[PDB]
Symmetry: D2
Subunit: 121 residues, 4 copies
Amino acid sequence: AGITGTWYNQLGSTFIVTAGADGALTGTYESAAGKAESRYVLTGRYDSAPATDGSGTALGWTVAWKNNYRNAHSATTWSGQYVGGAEARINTQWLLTIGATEANGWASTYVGHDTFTKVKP
Amino acid sequence: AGITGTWYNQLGSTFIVTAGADGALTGTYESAAGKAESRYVLTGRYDSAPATDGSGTALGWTVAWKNNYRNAHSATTWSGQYVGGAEARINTQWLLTIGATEANGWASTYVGHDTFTKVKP
Amino acid sequence: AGITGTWYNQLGSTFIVTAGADGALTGTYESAAGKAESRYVLTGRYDSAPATDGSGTALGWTVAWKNNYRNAHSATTWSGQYVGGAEARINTQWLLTIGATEANGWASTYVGHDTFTKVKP
Amino acid sequence: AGITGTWYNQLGSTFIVTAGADGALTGTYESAAGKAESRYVLTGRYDSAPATDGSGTALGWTVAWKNNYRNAHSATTWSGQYVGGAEARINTQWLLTIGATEANGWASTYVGHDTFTKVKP
Ligand SMILES: O=C(CCCC[C@@H]1SC[C@@H]2NC(=O)N[C@@H]21)NC1CCN(c2ccncc2)CC1
Ligand SMILES: O=C(CCCC[C@@H]1SC[C@@H]2NC(=O)N[C@@H]21)NC1CCN(c2ccncc2)CC1
Ligand SMILES: O=C(CCCC[C@@H]1SC[C@@H]2NC(=O)N[C@@H]21)NC1CCN(c2ccncc2)CC1
Ligand SMILES: O=C(CCCC[C@@H]1SC[C@@H]2NC(=O)N[C@@H]21)NC1CCN(c2ccncc2)CC1
């Protein structure tokens, strides 16, 4: 399965995840960047029976940036895939939406890309 | 608060969601487009304590496109926000990642936008 | 060809464009939103020999948000297609990048979607 | 200022650009991936008076994937910024829109990211 573990992206954020037999992803996310501190709940989904032709395993997950310590009124989803093997890796693109008035909605979404590996920064 | 229930986007897809007290989103997604049939599990997160300044409620969710009937080796995340009121809507952008070889990774992610309302278009 | 004309998006921004025989787009953009005033130079490209099977005409263009009156140190590209016929329309997605330090680069790009029609708001 | 010249991204594609005094980007793009062969015209814009606070220079450009050899009925825009220095780079995100019927419009746009450097990877 390969996905369960502790991953780090290029910003030094820490992605602690468990890939369940039902296709669920469950864990915590700690962002090294932004209006965020300590750990946040995450939940997502992954293809629990991927192709065997060398394709990666599609997955995605969501963090809402509220925990017991602060609330940044925003949420990020990551969409990507797990690529196993030599140096396993989760390649993602992400969308970060901030709570906004409908008038400011046009400016409410950031886009980016994160690459995760199991190598502690 | 007004999130739980059945929503429809401009493609006629059906988003059935429950917003739990812990910030969790759970439900089913039925896509009227693409390599999809019947319902798929979704899970996500939402800001359970949004701003009281008229801002929307930030949220997101993931569908992996595998159910008991078929497996499209892909996953979509929607990132967006709930805006309550007379014409309640959930405005989203989404990323759909397909399982891909490293060679084809550059072409592995689609982007789009879905507007969900309480009434079918 | 259909693209040459004055278009307006859902924000009330005004897109004045000329589609040239070489595949070039040339014109001005006036944004009804953001750190912008009056007109900005735009340049882009379009498929000058599109499919005849009912597909739209792929195109894109760029505005850097500097003119004689102000400079917002940012640029937007729109990628989309012209759909001719009953009510002609240009459907786009866009990416707005703000000048940033490499440390703040993660937060430097907004994503959105604009739909243009020739109907004055 | 340091923008003009030849750049390469992680796919081995070759970006040849001239930054003119009027904010214009002009050049050629040779893609090492996808339905592309040989050079394609590009045109774009860049901030010709960027911030003096260490921020990058915002920019963007478009390629329509038609040249004298072939027509892929599609176009890519790259939105990003030039960051000068010892390891100069142009960091971009991109949107690739394909010509599509209204029916298939939802699936008509790919998203990705390209990092351009002065040295081939
Ligand atoms: O910073 C966060 C939450 C932390 C996000 C961390 C991001 S997730 C993708 C990337 N990968 C990581 O590992 N980390 C980063 N939320 C802000 C966004 C900007 N905000 C506003 C408010 C008002 N106007 C404009 C902007 C306020 C809330
Ligand atoms: O169609 C789906 C899953 C259903 C997606 C429905 C999408 S979710 C965002 C939007 N909002 C909706 O309500 N519905 C649509 N997955 C395909 C994608 C394209 N695929 C390939 C494979 C190989 N090469 C190229 C493309 C194979 C798998
Ligand atoms: O607002 C503009 C330029 C006008 C953009 C208009 C946008 S183009 C897509 C959409 N379609 C339209 O028709 N109109 C809008 N640029 C800002 C962005 C936010 N900026 C910062 C600075 C520092 N930190 C965070 C954010 C400063 C520069
Ligand atoms: O491949 C290209 C044009 C070359 C794109 C190269 C891309 S630009 C961003 C990235 N950075 C690079 O340096 N190179 C790549 N266009 C295809 C796209 C997929 N197409 C369809 C058609 C019908 N159904 C589904 C898909 C047909 C046309």
